[PDB]
Write an enzyme that holds these catalytic residues in place. Sequence first.
Site, short mmCIF file in Angstrom:
data_model
loop_
_atom_site.label_atom_id
_atom_site.label_comp_id
_atom_site.label_asym_id
_atom_site.label_seq_id
_atom_site.Cartn_x
_atom_site.Cartn_y
_atom_site.Cartn_z
N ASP A 1 0.85 -1.17 0.00
CA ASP A 1 0.00 0.00 0.00
C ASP A 1 0.89 1.23 0.00
O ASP A 1 2.05 1.13 0.35
CB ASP A 1 -0.80 -0.01 1.30
N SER A 2 0.36 2.39 -0.37
CA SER A 2 1.15 3.61 -0.34
C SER A 2 1.28 4.12 1.08
O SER A 2 2.17 4.90 1.38
CB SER A 2 0.52 4.70 -1.22
N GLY B 1 -2.54 8.53 -5.32
CA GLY B 1 -3.78 8.99 -5.93
C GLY B 1 -3.86 10.27 -6.73
O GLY B 1 -4.93 10.63 -7.21
N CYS C 1 -4.36 -1.03 -2.12
CA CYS C 1 -4.55 0.34 -2.57
C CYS C 1 -5.53 0.35 -3.72
O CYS C 1 -5.31 -0.31 -4.72
CB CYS C 1 -3.16 0.91 -3.02
N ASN C 2 -6.57 1.18 -3.62
CA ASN C 2 -7.54 1.32 -4.67
C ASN C 2 -6.92 1.79 -5.96
O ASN C 2 -7.09 1.14 -7.00
CB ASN C 2 -8.63 2.27 -4.24
N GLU D 1 -8.09 23.49 6.94
CA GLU D 1 -8.00 22.62 8.11
C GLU D 1 -9.42 22.28 8.52
O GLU D 1 -10.38 22.89 8.07
CB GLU D 1 -7.28 23.32 9.26
N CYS E 1 -12.64 5.33 -0.51
CA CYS E 1 -11.76 5.98 0.44
C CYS E 1 -12.45 7.15 1.12
O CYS E 1 -13.20 7.90 0.51
CB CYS E 1 -10.51 6.45 -0.28
N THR E 2 -12.21 7.27 2.42
CA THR E 2 -12.79 8.34 3.20
C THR E 2 -11.76 9.32 3.74
O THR E 2 -10.75 8.92 4.34
CB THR E 2 -13.64 7.80 4.37
N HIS E 3 -12.02 10.60 3.50
CA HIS E 3 -11.18 11.71 3.96
C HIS E 3 -12.13 12.80 4.43
O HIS E 3 -13.06 13.17 3.72
CB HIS E 3 -10.30 12.26 2.83
#
Lengths: 252, 252
Positions: B7-8, B40, B70-71, B147, B178-180
């Site tokens: 994974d990254s 990404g 990793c997607n 932020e 993926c969640t951010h």
Amino acid sequence: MKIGIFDSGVGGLTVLKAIRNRYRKVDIVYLGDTARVPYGIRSKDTIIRYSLECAGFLKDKGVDIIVVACNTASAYALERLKKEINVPVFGVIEPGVKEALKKSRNKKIGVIGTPATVKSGAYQRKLEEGGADVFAKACPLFAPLAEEGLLEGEITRKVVEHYLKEFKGKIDTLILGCTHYPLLKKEIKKFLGDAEVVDSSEALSLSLHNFIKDDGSSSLELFFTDLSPNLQFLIKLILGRDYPVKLAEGVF
Amino acid sequence: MKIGIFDSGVGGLTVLKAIRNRYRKVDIVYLGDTARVPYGIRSKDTIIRYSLECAGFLKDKGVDIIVVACNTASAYALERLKKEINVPVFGVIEPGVKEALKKSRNKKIGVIGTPATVKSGAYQRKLEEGGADVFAKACPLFAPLAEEGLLEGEITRKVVEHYLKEFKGKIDTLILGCTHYPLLKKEIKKFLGDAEVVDSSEALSLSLHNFIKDDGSSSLELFFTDLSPNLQFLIKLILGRDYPVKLAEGVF
Ligand SMILES: NC(=O)CC[C@@H](N)C(=O)O
Ligand SMILES: NC(=O)CC[C@@H](N)C(=O)O
């Protein structure tokens, strides 16, 4: 008169709103240096050169004072800025320290800041020279690697705990130098318990009262050095409406 | 046998835990390419060269299969990987699509992915070839500029809304590519209302059942190409304890 405000991002748009609302007629020029967006990592001198350039750009836009709403820039570039731009320069650190020193009770106060702002010692020195036992920790830098996936639930309020360890039951006032997930505001006040958190933005805006001649055309101009991805949408959400932005060094 | 996982970042440590728990004896080598951490964003071919190198490193570590957790890498590098590493290669996209197709009811399913994974069309194609009306949106990239300060309260569940607009009342299953922040999991299920969210990690881990000979010494080895800041603490929080890590290309 015309107020120039700069920041590495869109965070300064909060201070900018406090000001615009308190100083109704004042003209405003904003510069967000989005092109070099992660300031808080770079060395002191790079922070200083970057600042000098943005402040120079605001000065050449005919502004009367310069508000650096960035903690990191304020921490290292204020002296140099004042000495090279021939105008009154204001940072976000001193109005916060003042507000902290004032609002405290026990003079035990904590500061959550960017690793670079926490490293300068500016808050620490200024709080200590105000008779304060300072508890300061750096902003946790998680998003580069991990996502808010792992960091959700158990781990979010376990990273908080571990991070705001020394603060536990000794501080009563906090300067939120900067918040980055999971150390959000609602998450931190719930661990520290209800503590008085400084509003650095209202403190700064209020702090310019004696320098501001509340006059002008209520003009607003937004400039960024990189027309980043969702920047245009961030503006509509912070200011409340859509404001046209220019690339710094376009028509000029 | 020995399973290689890459994974990254540290996100793959979730899949790695599912696997270690389900395959009790299996040996495991992990490679997180932290040195080039934001995958990404980079172009397809750079994603492919990076992947080839990490998969090559796992192969030269004597592994029997390779799981790309990793997607983005899964989306563009799987073919090339299989064709150049002479081992079974598994990605996180197909077990999720399968699990989505299965779990749905109305075959209207949404995918929140990284701008690069969403761009490949891999989920879209695979969901459509399963008879699905796909609703996909890219991960909002906010932290570079802003932020979680502005983005807290009003704006957090206003960015959600605007982002998960098209999903409103047409989907019943979601692949959380993926969640951010602020599009965290608890925030998104509350807008979409309770929907069945795919657990891509358990789907992937489960999916290797027929290839895994559950044998070995239960060994675990963690490798990263950059011994990043709080990486060492992220490990203690995801795996549950402290695991010693090596720099990829140290003793080797
Ligand atoms: N308004 C702000 O909080 C500015 C924060 C910014 N100075 C930082 O160091 O992250
Ligand atoms: N386990 C995961 O969700 C991996 C996510 C990662 N593939 C991404 O594209 O952000």
